[PDB]
Write a protein that binds this ligand. Structure first.
Ligand SMILES: Nc1ncnc2c1ncn2[C@H]1C[C@H](O)[C@@H](COP(=O)(O)OP(=O)(O)OP(=O)(O)O)O1
Ligand SMILES: [Ca+2]
Ligand SMILES: [K+]
Length: 430
DNA sequence: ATTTTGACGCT
């Protein structure tokens, strides 16, 4: 009891831009705003592959990974914006720069960990302490939380969505103990106030809307974020975890969406996160390893300790292209030309990165996939990255991979290459 | 024939 940790020591948010690439294109082209629309890369093969979908179009069943021709079958009036193409490949620069806009705004409020192009974790513990000092026992008005849901409420003894939201928020605020500055529920509530302010600032200064989760750790904040989308935020309190987890499929928890989550389900014969509480820590370590077992034992109780890392910039800068089916690279000239295209984009982005961020990459990673291999990467080799020069980087990549060619004819390449990948890594300050 | 990314763990 008095010594049992409860994982209530931090306030952590996860901010997720809503359908981000779509919003970037809608800001640029007002004709696309408030319409069913999607972002597509390439156009020749089946109308192009959809990579982002507005919520209006999701209502028709349009999803990412879908071909645009098929999406048009579900949504005949679907509007499309195309990813820019440069040097023969999709170029994501517009979205990376929009991401920087948002991340720099978020960084004014607190330390952020860039989780993806449109996702950041936020460590709010210190900001919440300061705001609590400013408030001086003053109660928190529901007006300060105009887009916040409290997971699990309302409960106990209106048929509209906003009415339910307000009822749950009212119950939560009515129960709060505003006089205890160490109260974890109060701390989460102040965190939610700050996140409302952050999201307002993002929308005012960029036009972009986002959703957010607020809880005591990254996994719960990420889970909370997806409960009420778009353009809303959700507070998941420690006390909400038993009911929330009691029907929560294991695969919905971050890092359990793949093979490990499948093995948890299969070996233990369970379906929901809460069922994990019935195993000892040693049982879980015996099945899943020391690290995973301890992590699951704590996580099914709502407890997780992974820190928000102070990192606003990506650790790697990479460029890749697939060559599916008939397009697989079968000559040496082809392989070298595409290595050159990838290296030119990489040099452009690296030079910009060096000027913006006072750092230099020192390692070049080359990855390839051969036709027939089911794995995404068949081979990975590295060489020194000593000059931001595309011809040198492409020549070096060719040198490290050229011995993979089985073909006895020098001009021909076999087995054909279905993927090329150049990644600059190992940054040092400059 | 999703494609193009990015982070981290194991050995
Ligand atoms: N599998 C993918 N392939 C290519 N691009 C992707 C892929 N997944 C995501 N992206 C890009 C496009 C998205 O706008 C952006 C953010 O991804 P993601 O958060 O999963 O969806 P989303 O922002 O489009 O919608 P949501 O509102 O549900 O968050 O990253
Ligand atoms: Ca998103
Ligand atoms: K996401």
């Amino acid at each position: 009891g008095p010594h049992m940790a409860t994982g209530q020591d931090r306030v952590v948010a996860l901010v997720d831009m809503d359908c981000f690439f779509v919003q970037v294109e809608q800001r640029q082209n007002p004709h696309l705003r408030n319409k069913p629309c999607a972002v597509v890369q390439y156009k020749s093969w089946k109308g192009g592959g959809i990579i982002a979908v507005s919520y209006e179009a999701r209502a028709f069943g349009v999803t990412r990974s879908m071909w645009a021709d098929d999406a048009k079958k579900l949504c005949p009036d679907l509007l499309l914006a195309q990813v820019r193409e440069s040097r023969g490949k999709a170029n994501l620069t517009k979205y990376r720069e929009a991401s920087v806009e948002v991340m720099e705004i978020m960084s004014r409020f607190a330390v952020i960990e860039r989780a993806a192009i449109d996702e950041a974790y936020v460590d709010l513990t210190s900001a919440v302490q300061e705001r609590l000092q400013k408030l001086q026992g003053q109660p928190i008005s529901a007006d300060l939380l105009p887009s916040t849901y409290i997971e699990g409420l309302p409960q106990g003894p209106t048929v509209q969505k906003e009415g339910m939201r307000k009822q749950g928020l009212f119950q939560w605020l009515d129960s709060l103990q505003i006089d205890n500055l160490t109260s974890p529920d109060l701390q989460l509530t102040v965190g939610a106030v700050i996140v409302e302010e952050m999201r307002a600032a993002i929308e005012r200064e960029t036009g972009f809307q986002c959703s957010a989760g607020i809880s005591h750790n990254k996994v719960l904040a990420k889970l909370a974020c997806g409960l009420n989308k778009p353009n809303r935020q959700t507070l998941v309190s420690h006390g909400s975890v038993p009911q929330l987890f009691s029907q929560m499929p294991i695969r919905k928890i971050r890092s359990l969406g793949g093979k490990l989550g499948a093995s948890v389900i299969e070996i233990l014969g369970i379906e929901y996160m809460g069922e994990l509480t019935q195993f000892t820590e040693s049982q879980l370590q015996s099945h899943f390893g020391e690290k995973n077992g301890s992590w699951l034992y704590a996580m099914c109780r709502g407890i997780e300790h992974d820190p928000v890392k102070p990192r606003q910039l990506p650790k790697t800068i990479g460029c890749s292209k697939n060559f599916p089916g008939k397009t697989a690279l079968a000559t040496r000239e082809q392989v070298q030309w595409w290595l050159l295209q990838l290296a030119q984009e990489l040099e452009e982005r690296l030079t910009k990165d060096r000027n913006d961020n006072d750092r230099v990459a020192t390692q070049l990673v080359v990855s390839i996939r051969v036709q027939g291999d089911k794995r995404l990467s068949s081979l990975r080799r590295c060489c020194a990255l000593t000059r931001y020069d595309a011809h040198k980087m492409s020549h070096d990549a060719f040198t490290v991979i050229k011995n993979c060619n089985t073909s006895g004819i020098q001009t021909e390449w076999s087995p054909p290459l279905t993927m090329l990948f150049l990644c600059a890594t190992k940054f040092s300050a400059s």
